[PDB]
Amino acid sequence: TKRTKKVGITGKFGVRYGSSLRRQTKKLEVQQHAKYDCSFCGKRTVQRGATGIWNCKSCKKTVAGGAYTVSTAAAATVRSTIRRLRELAEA
Amino acid sequence: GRVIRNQRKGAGSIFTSHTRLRKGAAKLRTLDYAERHGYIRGVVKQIIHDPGRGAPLAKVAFRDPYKYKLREETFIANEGVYTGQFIYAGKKASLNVGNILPLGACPEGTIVSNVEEKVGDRGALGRTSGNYVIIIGHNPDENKTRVKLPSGAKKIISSDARGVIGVVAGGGRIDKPLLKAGRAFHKYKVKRNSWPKTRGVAMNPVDHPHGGGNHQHIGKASTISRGAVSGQKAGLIAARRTGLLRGTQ
RNA sequence: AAUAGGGUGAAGCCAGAGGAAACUCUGGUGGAGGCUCGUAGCGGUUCUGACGUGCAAAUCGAUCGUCGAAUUUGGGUAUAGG
RNA sequence: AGUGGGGAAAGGUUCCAUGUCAACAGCAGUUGGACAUGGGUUAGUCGAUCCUAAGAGAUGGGGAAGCUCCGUUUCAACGUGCUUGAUUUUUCAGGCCAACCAUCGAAAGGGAAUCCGGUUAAAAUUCCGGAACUUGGAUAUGGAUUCUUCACGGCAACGUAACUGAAUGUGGAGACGUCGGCGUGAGCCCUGGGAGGAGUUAUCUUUUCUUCUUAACAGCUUAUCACCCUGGAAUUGGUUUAUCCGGAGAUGGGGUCUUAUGGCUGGAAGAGCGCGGUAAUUUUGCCGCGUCCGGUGCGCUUACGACGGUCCUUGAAAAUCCACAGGAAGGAAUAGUUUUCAUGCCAAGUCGUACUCAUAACCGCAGCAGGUCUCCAAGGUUAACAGCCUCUAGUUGAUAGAAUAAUGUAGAUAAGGGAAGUCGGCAAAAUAGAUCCGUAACUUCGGGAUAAGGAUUGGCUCUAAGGAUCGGUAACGAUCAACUUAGAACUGGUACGGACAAGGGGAAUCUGACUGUCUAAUUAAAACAUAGCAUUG
RNA sequence: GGGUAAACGGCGGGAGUAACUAUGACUCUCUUAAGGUAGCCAAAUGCCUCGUCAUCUAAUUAGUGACGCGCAUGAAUGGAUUAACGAGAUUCCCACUGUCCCUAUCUACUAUCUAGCGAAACCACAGCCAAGGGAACGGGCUUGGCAGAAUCAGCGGGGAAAGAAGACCCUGUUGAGCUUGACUCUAGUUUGACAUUGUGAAAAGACGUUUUUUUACUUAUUCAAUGAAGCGGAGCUGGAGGUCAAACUCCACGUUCUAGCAUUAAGCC
RNA sequence: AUAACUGGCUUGUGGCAGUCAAGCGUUCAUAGCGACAUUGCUUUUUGAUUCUUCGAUGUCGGCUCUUCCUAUCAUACCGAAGCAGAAUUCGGUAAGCGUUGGAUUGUUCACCCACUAAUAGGGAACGUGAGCUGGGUUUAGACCGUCGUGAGACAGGUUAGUUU
RNA sequence: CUUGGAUUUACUGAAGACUAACUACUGCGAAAGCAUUUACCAAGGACGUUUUCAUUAAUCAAGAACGAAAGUUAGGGGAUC
Ligand SMILES: CN[C@@H]1[C@@H](O)[C@@H](O[C@@H]2[C@@H](O)[C@H](O[C@H]3O[C@H]([C@@H](C)O)[C@@H](O)[C@H](O)[C@H]3N)[C@@H](N)C[C@H]2N)OC[C@]1(C)O
Ligand SMILES: CN[C@@H]1[C@@H](O)[C@@H](O[C@@H]2[C@@H](O)[C@H](O[C@H]3O[C@H]([C@@H](C)O)[C@@H](O)[C@H](O)[C@H]3N)[C@@H](N)C[C@H]2N)OC[C@]1(C)O
Ligand SMILES: CN[C@@H]1[C@@H](O)[C@@H](O[C@@H]2[C@@H](O)[C@H](O[C@H]3O[C@H]([C@@H](C)O)[C@@H](O)[C@H](O)[C@H]3N)[C@@H](N)C[C@H]2N)OC[C@]1(C)O
Ligand SMILES: [Zn+2]
């Protein structure tokens, strides 16, 4: 059954710290503990070791990433920006 | 009165940094012939957690140009760098994430990290998780590059100064609240002894310029002159203004 | 180096039911938490109890707080009188 | 979870035997941690010694009038280098290199190697008896290797008694948090048969208690995980208590490896233990027989394993040992190796070692109800390592006698009333376990909540349900086995969580969000901290 | 002279005015840096004060809800709330009871008596009252009452009982902790001159020397890296610039799908 | 040599009692009252003073307990009346005998509820802390308001604070 | 605001918005709405059809998707109004 209506993973915090602080924690903790697709072997086996470190249990490859998600929006933009500036320079 | 906590920090007795578990200093390679004239290739062996640091570090192996020997390097890992990746460092390095290039070889708008202030100091700028340096423009006649620092400041640096392409990994730490005194305890347990912080107004007059009184209050302006002496600089030192910031800056 | 025995039952997982759909509901499983009752431990509320030329230059009895962490603790080491 | 058996710190002879009682043991004393005289501490394997930790600290140096301060990744011409081909001429000759490294810093971190039985008045992993191991060195014999010079086998994972390998480089071990359930082993607990001994016996108990044990080390063997070969998958399958795995090759079939742990044998019955006999004023005994075969588990403790969770926390270093890459050099034919194969030989220095470890061996002026780190841990009841009773072991120590006024201290009970007492319900009483039922306002939706508030509970005799292993619609038969749950009848002075153990609750206001912290020895709070928020450089 | 309050802080008076009265939406005037906004309240902040009304009780200086010209509430000197939590302060209620009416009875250990052992505080001398006077509250002195050894258990009237050269107050030309726009200084820091300190150029100044501004050199001096490894210049190779004399400019000059390897030079003269 | 208790002197102030008699009392100064004045007493108020105590006399109230005073609330006996009875009022001898239970407050005091014959007032070092208690006051912790630039102040409020 | 030269002139640059003129009794979309270039993604009405199914339909309590502007939360930006 649906055990909690809205607190979700932050049910471990009970009634403490305030609802806004627990709700802000819930957004990032779900991402923190989620399984991600490996871009190397194609399996959903990427988990966080520590902040900025993401390991694949299958192919044993570690990639540097965000604090709570594998990739941040700024890093994604840089790849396109660095991709773009690369060919505009090599041509 | 008495020597205040501000003053006691500088003697460095109980206030030295806690460095037993740290994984080595994060630096670029020394400028050598290979990086001055061409490039050198290394391989990422590990991406590791450094206690006291929000950003992960990369251990990268290079051949020694002059004798049969391996060299391990401790870099600040940019986001997207992975174990087994080849890292190219030098003047001829391609414009890819993780490569170490001089700032003169990067076009306008390149995002770069662990940037040197002076040529060959192995990195000073944009080193924390989620931070980076933007290249604003070039001054090829003067061999100077203009960059945008994480704080918003703009700075002219030598075009021979190096930097690492990409954004420092581990970004977004501060988005999640700490929620607990204990999380702060564990945070500073591997940094230094700066937590918890007793308020100056909660002390007696011997302890702090803010102490004493039959109510807790400061009693004089908390904005202190830059020319004040040690023991007086508690509060907002040389503040150009105070109060809630409204509008833009 | 040390920390009985219980209670509660977070994510994740399995199975079933309802609905036109969007979605919703149920039974298990699991074993989270500066969570909880409560020993050892650590502390020290009250009796303004005992004692108050004491067993003791701070103790004794009962009653109490807390008891998996900002926990308790041995040894080593550092900080020295404006 | 000891008033048991040991240790670390600290003490220093308090240890043991003999003698002794003036003082001391707040009474006593024939007794003593007292007094006197002697005796007593045995190591290649246990520690120290060595390593590095936080840190301490010499040195070319830079300060300071100077005592000295600063620096140790230290602005330095910093080896009391190393290996060969040998030479003895105690001379040579070359070739490799010098990034790092003075030194101190742990009797709980790291670390070469020992067990069992016996023995004293007092020592023992140190002595005796037997059986091993490590390191360093020497070196002989056998084996292995070589005419294809530096071994063979296996498709492979890899196997073996061996089975060249310089400089240099690289890798591994040392070497690491915490929690959760699960699995295995060991010790303990429980239990059947049998062979001895003890107990009880008015009656009975195929009975009540007790002995039946097996070290280090050596050989063979033994495993979760992991890995290899084959094969090619949807009707997706395999699979954990916990849902993860498979065209990056699952399921199926067959193999390989680690030896944690168990098994058999050697050690080793010759020992130890239990009975029985016999010599003898006896040192010390000597002999006979036995010492066997099973079962069980959400048991307790502990070790290990495979997993899973957790962090803005990711949980030492060094000495030391091994391996690999490399291909220098040296090697054959009637001949060079190598002590990483077996056997054989020699040696292992120095200091500590008695005893106490506490209601009398330490610190508190003392034999002081205080303080002072840690290991082992039986039966019953129980959720329980709580409380209560008991076995082994250890104590029976604390001046004593006679009485039992008042007032005390500690503990009880009390008719009717029920806070009228008092600043104030202070103190005390009341509640309390477990099963079932029932549970409001409010709420940050997590809680509030054991809300509130009801019912039940013994003993005895039964019944039902929940399994394992064998054997071919086996939906069955056989053999074995742990305690949980549920129901029924009967029964009593209506008792029954029968001792023990064990929340009182509700409606609000003020205040601090919370967990946390401080005035050691009159204030624990609303004070401090805290996450969150903002400002400043 | 400008900015700044989540810096320290601050956040008003006096008159009149509505067809009963009363009040005053409204008006005038003085004045400030601004005149307290949203909220909240006899609150841990309100003197007056036990404020007034309501509720709670038989009865309430308590509690709670209201009211608000609030001595002297009020917005990160944070305002108002607020589930949960609290050995925090407070009121009421149910249960409960020796807290009480109003005391009684019981037990152990004392006390008690004995054998042994055996302190300390304190002590001018001492120790019965009433009055008087008196340093204005006497054990002693005056006048009276009276007055008989030795004692035991209790007791808390008195000994202005003991404990400590009053800690409150005042004085002292005695201090100390703390503060500041006290007096007098001071580490630090900042600003100028001179010295360290040399070699040139251009342009403005004043009598071949000189003041000022800028900017040139490198060797003094300062910062940094390294196991002081590739610096500066020239040249050999190519490529582009279409050359025209003639080789004149610029560029490069061994490494980029892959977690391999690179060490102790081959070759040539 | 000097304040903050008690005590002593004083008695303004507080409390109590007289003398006179303008008026009130249906007429009637004096049953019962009594203006303007004026004489006293007491030490249960508070001042004034500074004599004793600063090598310390334990500094609120309550609880408990004894005793004393009388300026008598009740009870005994009586005199007076604007005393018909009933009730009530004034006065005498009288302290023999009693003078309560509660809500709020730390309170003395105050104020209500209720009973009662009555719910009189006082003293005893403002009786009584080696009798207790410790709510208040009055050390050190903490909060608020006003004041102060500040350290801090406040017969302003609040909470916690060893009784030999 | 301006002799510290404001305003005005030329060049370069940095920001965020917006998409003029073409633009209409014209288009598309369920509505709210939608206007620079280009490419990709899936969607749609109408038309044409001698293609196909064969009543599968209409409107609809309950129940759902979307919904200008203003407003709210957290980041980022904050030129102009
Ligand atoms: C504010 N002025 C103070 C001044 O009062 C004085 O302080 C002394 C201090 O120095 C004394 O302390 C002195 O003596 C003691 C001890 C031996 O008594 C020492 O421990 C100490 O080192 C020594 N300085 C201290 N006992 C009293 C303070 N008032 O000393 C100077 C000063 C610090 O500036
Ligand atoms: C003008 N004389 C200078 C003389 O002062 C000196 O320079 C030092 C220089 O050697 C130091 O630098 C040196 O020392 C540092 C050390 C201090 O950590 C080292 O780390 C560094 O490698 C080494 N080069 C530099 N840090 C300061 C200069 N004044 O040596 C160079 C010189 C030219 O002789
Ligand atoms: C036992 N409860 C009593 C209650 O009866 C009452 O007592 C009063 C008492 O205070 C009065 O007494 C009071 O009032 C008188 C005044 C009236 O004259 C004063 O003189 C006196 O000093 C004062 N204590 C006394 N006259 C009658 C009792 N019932 O009030 C006080 C109390 C404690 O509540
Ligand atoms: Zn992968």
Coordinates of C-alpha atoms (C1' of nucleotides) in Angstrom, one line a residue, chain D residues 175-484:
Chain D
rA175 C1' 46.1 -1.6 5.1
rC176 C1' 41.6 -0.1 8.0
rG177 C1' 34.2 3.4 9.2
rU178 C1' 29.4 2.1 10.8
rC179 C1' 24.6 -0.4 11.0
rG180 C1' 21.0 -4.5 9.3
rG181 C1' 19.2 -9.1 8.6
rC182 C1' 20.9 -14.0 6.5
rG183 C1' 24.4 -18.5 6.3
rU184 C1' 28.4 -21.6 8.3
rG185 C1' 31.9 -23.1 12.2
rA186 C1' 33.7 -23.3 17.3
rG187 C1' 32.9 -23.1 22.7
rC188 C1' 28.8 -23.3 26.0
rC189 C1' 23.7 -24.9 26.9
rC190 C1' 20.1 -29.3 26.3
rU191 C1' 19.4 -34.5 25.3
rG192 C1' 19.3 -40.8 24.2
rG193 C1' 21.9 -45.5 24.8
rG194 C1' 26.0 -47.9 27.3
rA195 C1' 30.4 -48.8 30.8
rG196 C1' 32.1 -47.1 36.0
rG197 C1' 31.3 -44.3 40.8
rA198 C1' 28.3 -41.4 44.5
rG199 C1' 23.2 -40.2 46.5
rU200 C1' 18.0 -41.2 48.2
rU201 C1' 15.1 -45.3 49.7
rA202 C1' 8.3 -45.8 55.0
rU203 C1' 6.8 -45.6 49.2
rC204 C1' 8.6 -44.5 44.4
rU205 C1' 11.9 -42.6 40.8
rU206 C1' 14.7 -48.2 33.6
rU207 C1' 16.0 -43.0 38.9
rU208 C1' 19.0 -37.8 41.5
rC209 C1' 24.3 -36.3 40.7
rU210 C1' 28.9 -37.3 38.5
rU211 C1' 33.6 -39.5 34.5
rC212 C1' 33.8 -40.9 29.3
rU213 C1' 38.9 -35.7 27.0
rU214 C1' 42.3 -34.7 22.7
rA215 C1' 47.0 -28.9 21.8
rA216 C1' 50.6 -26.6 18.5
rC217 C1' 52.2 -28.8 14.4
rA218 C1' 52.5 -32.6 9.4
rG219 C1' 49.9 -35.1 5.2
rC220 C1' 45.5 -36.0 2.3
rU221 C1' 40.8 -33.8 1.8
rU222 C1' 37.1 -30.1 2.4
rA223 C1' 33.9 -23.6 0.2
rU224 C1' 30.5 -19.4 -0.3
rC225 C1' 32.4 -16.1 -3.7
rA226 C1' 35.0 -15.7 -8.3
rC227 C1' 36.7 -17.8 -12.8
rC228 C1' 37.0 -21.2 -17.4
rC229 C1' 34.7 -24.6 -21.5
rU230 C1' 30.2 -25.8 -24.1
rG231 C1' 25.7 -23.8 -25.7
rG232 C1' 22.5 -19.7 -27.7
rA233 C1' 17.6 -17.7 -24.6
rA234 C1' 10.0 -14.2 -25.1
rU235 C1' 5.5 -18.7 -23.8
rU236 C1' 11.4 -14.2 -20.8
rG237 C1' 13.9 -17.4 -17.4
rG238 C1' 17.1 -18.1 -12.9
rU239 C1' 16.9 -16.4 -8.1
rU240 C1' 17.5 -13.9 -2.2
rU241 C1' 14.4 -13.2 4.3
rA242 C1' 16.0 -8.7 1.7
rU243 C1' 15.0 -7.9 -6.7
rC244 C1' 18.9 -8.4 -8.7
rC245 C1' 21.1 -11.0 -13.0
rG246 C1' 21.3 -12.6 -18.5
rG247 C1' 23.2 -11.6 -26.7
rA248 C1' 28.8 -7.2 -22.6
rG249 C1' 26.1 -14.6 -23.2
rA250 C1' 21.0 -16.3 -18.8
rU251 C1' 18.8 -21.2 -17.7
rG252 C1' 21.2 -26.3 -18.6
rG253 C1' 25.8 -29.6 -18.6
rG254 C1' 31.1 -30.0 -17.3
rG255 C1' 35.4 -28.1 -14.9
rU256 C1' 39.2 -24.5 -12.2
rC257 C1' 40.8 -21.7 -7.9
rU258 C1' 41.2 -19.3 -2.5
rU259 C1' 41.4 -23.3 2.6
rA260 C1' 38.2 -19.5 6.2
rU261 C1' 36.1 -23.9 8.4
rG262 C1' 35.1 -28.9 9.0
rG263 C1' 36.7 -34.5 8.3
rC264 C1' 40.4 -38.8 8.6
rU265 C1' 45.3 -40.1 9.9
rG266 C1' 50.1 -38.8 12.4
rG267 C1' 51.1 -36.0 17.2
rA268 C1' 48.3 -39.9 20.8
rA269 C1' 47.3 -42.7 24.8
rG270 C1' 52.5 -43.7 26.1
rA271 C1' 49.0 -38.2 28.3
rG272 C1' 44.8 -36.7 31.2
rC273 C1' 40.3 -38.6 33.6
rG274 C1' 37.2 -42.5 36.1
rC275 C1' 37.1 -47.0 38.9
rG276 C1' 39.7 -51.3 41.5
rG277 C1' 43.9 -53.6 43.9
rU278 C1' 48.6 -53.8 46.5
rA279 C1' 53.9 -52.9 49.1
rA280 C1' 54.6 -49.6 53.2
rU281 C1' 55.9 -45.8 60.1
rU282 C1' 58.4 -45.1 53.6
rU283 C1' 61.4 -41.1 49.5
rU284 C1' 58.0 -41.5 45.5
rG285 C1' 54.8 -45.3 44.0
rC286 C1' 53.4 -49.9 41.1
rC287 C1' 49.6 -52.9 38.6
rG288 C1' 44.6 -54.1 36.3
rC289 C1' 40.3 -52.4 33.5
rG290 C1' 37.7 -48.7 31.0
rU291 C1' 37.9 -44.1 28.7
rC292 C1' 32.4 -45.9 23.6
rC293 C1' 28.1 -44.8 20.1
rG294 C1' 24.4 -41.0 18.9
rG295 C1' 20.4 -36.6 18.7
rU296 C1' 18.8 -31.5 18.7
rG297 C1' 18.1 -25.7 17.8
rC298 C1' 14.6 -18.2 15.5
rG299 C1' 19.1 -21.2 22.2
rC300 C1' 23.8 -18.0 24.3
rU301 C1' 28.5 -16.0 23.1
rU302 C1' 32.1 -15.5 19.5
rA303 C1' 34.8 -16.0 14.6
rC304 C1' 34.2 -16.0 9.6
rG305 C1' 31.4 -15.5 4.9
rA306 C1' 28.1 -13.7 1.1
rC307 C1' 24.9 -9.6 0.8
rG308 C1' 22.2 -4.9 1.7
rG309 C1' 21.9 0.3 3.8
rU310 C1' 24.4 5.0 5.1
rC311 C1' 27.2 10.2 4.7
rC312 C1' 27.8 18.5 2.1
rU313 C1' 31.1 12.4 7.3
rU314 C1' 33.6 8.0 2.5
rG315 C1' 36.3 6.2 7.6
rA316 C1' 46.1 6.3 9.3
rA317 C1' 51.2 5.9 8.2
rA318 C1' 55.7 3.4 7.9
rA319 C1' 58.9 -0.6 8.6
rU320 C1' 58.6 -5.2 6.3
rC321 C1' 57.5 -9.4 2.8
rC322 C1' 56.2 -11.2 -2.1
rA323 C1' 55.2 -11.1 -7.3
rC324 C1' 55.5 -9.4 -12.0
rA325 C1' 57.7 -6.5 -16.4
rG326 C1' 62.6 -6.2 -18.3
rG327 C1' 66.5 -9.1 -20.8
rA328 C1' 72.3 -7.7 -18.4
rA329 C1' 75.3 -11.7 -17.5
rG330 C1' 76.4 -16.5 -17.2
rG331 C1' 75.5 -21.1 -18.9
rA332 C1' 75.5 -27.7 -22.8
rA333 C1' 77.3 -33.3 -24.1
rU334 C1' 80.3 -37.4 -21.8
rA335 C1' 78.6 -31.4 -18.9
rG336 C1' 77.2 -25.6 -16.1
rU337 C1' 73.2 -25.0 -12.4
rU338 C1' 69.8 -24.2 -7.3
rU339 C1' 69.9 -24.0 -0.7
rU340 C1' 62.1 -20.6 -3.9
rC341 C1' 62.3 -29.6 -4.1
rA342 C1' 63.6 -33.1 0.2
rU343 C1' 66.9 -34.5 4.0
rG344 C1' 71.2 -33.3 6.9
rC345 C1' 74.5 -29.3 10.2
rC346 C1' 75.2 -24.7 13.6
rA347 C1' 73.3 -20.5 16.4
rA348 C1' 69.5 -17.1 18.5
rG349 C1' 72.2 -11.6 22.6
rU350 C1' 70.0 -7.5 26.4
rC351 C1' 66.1 -5.8 29.8
rG352 C1' 61.0 -7.2 32.2
rU353 C1' 58.7 -11.7 34.5
rA354 C1' 57.1 -12.6 42.4
rC355 C1' 52.5 -10.3 44.2
rU356 C1' 48.0 -6.6 44.6
rC357 C1' 44.8 -4.5 40.8
rA358 C1' 41.2 -2.7 45.2
rU359 C1' 34.6 -2.0 50.8
rA360 C1' 42.9 -3.2 53.1
rA361 C1' 48.6 -3.7 48.4
rC362 C1' 46.9 2.5 43.5
rC363 C1' 45.0 8.1 44.5
rG364 C1' 42.1 10.6 48.1
rC365 C1' 46.8 12.8 55.2
rA366 C1' 44.1 6.2 56.8
rG367 C1' 43.1 -0.8 56.2
rC368 C1' 38.4 6.3 53.9
rA369 C1' 30.6 3.7 51.9
rG370 C1' 34.6 8.4 47.1
rG371 C1' 37.7 7.7 42.4
rU372 C1' 40.4 4.5 39.0
rC373 C1' 40.8 1.3 31.8
rU374 C1' 39.5 -3.8 30.2
rC375 C1' 38.9 -9.8 29.0
rC376 C1' 36.0 -14.7 30.4
rA377 C1' 30.4 -15.5 31.9
rA378 C1' 26.4 -22.0 34.0
rG379 C1' 20.7 -23.9 35.3
rG380 C1' 15.3 -22.1 36.3
rU381 C1' 11.7 -17.9 35.4
rU382 C1' 11.5 -14.1 31.4
rA383 C1' 11.2 -10.2 25.8
rA384 C1' 15.7 -9.7 28.8
rC385 C1' 23.1 -10.1 30.0
rA386 C1' 16.6 -6.7 34.3
rG387 C1' 14.7 -8.5 39.1
rC388 C1' 14.2 -13.3 42.1
rC389 C1' 16.2 -18.6 43.4
rU390 C1' 20.4 -22.1 42.5
rC391 C1' 25.6 -24.9 40.7
rU392 C1' 31.2 -24.1 40.2
rA393 C1' 34.4 -20.6 42.8
rG394 C1' 34.8 -17.2 46.9
rU395 C1' 33.5 -15.0 51.5
rU396 C1' 30.9 -15.4 56.3
rG397 C1' 34.7 -9.4 56.9
rA398 C1' 32.1 -4.6 59.3
rU399 C1' 33.5 -4.2 68.4
rA400 C1' 30.4 -7.1 71.4
rG401 C1' 26.5 -8.2 75.4
rA402 C1' 21.6 -6.9 77.8
rA403 C1' 17.1 -4.4 77.2
rU404 C1' 13.3 -2.4 73.7
rA405 C1' 11.3 4.8 77.2
rA406 C1' 10.9 9.6 74.7
rU407 C1' 12.7 12.1 70.2
rG408 C1' 14.8 10.5 65.7
rU409 C1' 16.6 7.6 60.8
rA410 C1' 14.7 3.9 57.3
rG411 C1' 10.2 1.2 56.3
rA412 C1' 4.7 -0.1 56.9
rU413 C1' -0.8 0.1 57.8
rA414 C1' -5.2 2.8 58.9
rA415 C1' -12.6 3.9 59.8
rG416 C1' -15.4 8.2 57.3
rG417 C1' -14.0 12.3 54.4
rG418 C1' -10.7 13.2 50.0
rA419 C1' -6.2 18.7 49.1
rA420 C1' -10.5 21.2 53.6
rG421 C1' -3.4 20.8 54.5
rU422 C1' 0.4 24.0 52.1
rC423 C1' 3.5 29.4 48.8
rG424 C1' 2.7 25.1 45.9
rG425 C1' -0.4 18.0 46.0
rC426 C1' 6.0 18.8 48.6
rA427 C1' 5.9 13.8 50.1
rA428 C1' 3.0 9.5 49.3
rA429 C1' -0.8 7.0 46.8
rA430 C1' -2.9 5.6 42.4
rU431 C1' -1.3 3.4 37.0
rA432 C1' 1.8 -0.4 35.2
rG433 C1' 3.3 -6.9 31.7
rA434 C1' 0.9 -9.4 27.6
rU435 C1' -3.6 -10.5 24.2
rC436 C1' -8.1 -8.4 22.1
rC437 C1' -11.3 -4.0 21.4
rG438 C1' -11.6 1.2 21.1
rU439 C1' -9.2 6.0 20.5
rA440 C1' -10.7 13.3 20.1
rA441 C1' -9.1 18.3 19.1
rC442 C1' -5.1 19.7 16.3
rU443 C1' -1.3 18.8 12.5
rU444 C1' 4.5 20.8 9.2
rC445 C1' 0.2 14.8 7.0
rG446 C1' 5.5 12.5 9.4
rG447 C1' 2.4 12.6 14.0
rG448 C1' -0.6 13.5 18.3
rA449 C1' -1.1 7.8 20.4
rU450 C1' 0.2 3.3 25.2
rA451 C1' -4.4 9.6 23.5
rA452 C1' -8.7 8.8 26.3
rG453 C1' -10.9 4.3 27.8
rG454 C1' -12.8 -1.1 28.2
rA455 C1' -12.4 -6.7 28.4
rU456 C1' -9.1 -10.9 29.3
rU457 C1' -5.1 -13.6 32.0
rG458 C1' -4.4 -19.7 37.0
rG459 C1' -4.3 -25.0 37.1
rC460 C1' -5.5 -29.5 34.7
rU461 C1' -7.1 -32.9 30.5
rC462 C1' -7.4 -32.4 25.4
rU463 C1' -7.9 -30.8 20.1
rA464 C1' -6.3 -28.3 15.7
rA465 C1' -2.7 -25.6 12.5
rG466 C1' 2.2 -24.2 11.0
rG467 C1' 7.9 -28.8 8.9
rA468 C1' 12.5 -31.9 7.4
rU469 C1' 14.5 -36.4 4.9
rC470 C1' 13.7 -40.8 2.3
rG471 C1' 10.8 -43.8 -1.4
rG472 C1' 7.7 -43.9 -8.8
rU473 C1' -3.8 -37.9 -9.0
rA474 C1' 3.7 -38.8 -4.7
rA475 C1' -3.1 -35.1 -3.4
rC476 C1' 0.7 -40.9 -0.9
rG477 C1' 3.5 -44.1 2.7
rA478 C1' 7.6 -44.4 6.0
rU479 C1' 11.2 -42.2 9.7
rC480 C1' 12.4 -38.0 12.4
rA481 C1' 11.9 -33.2 14.8
rA482 C1' 11.7 -26.9 17.4
rC483 C1' 8.1 -24.5 20.1
rU484 C1' 4.7 -20.9 18.5

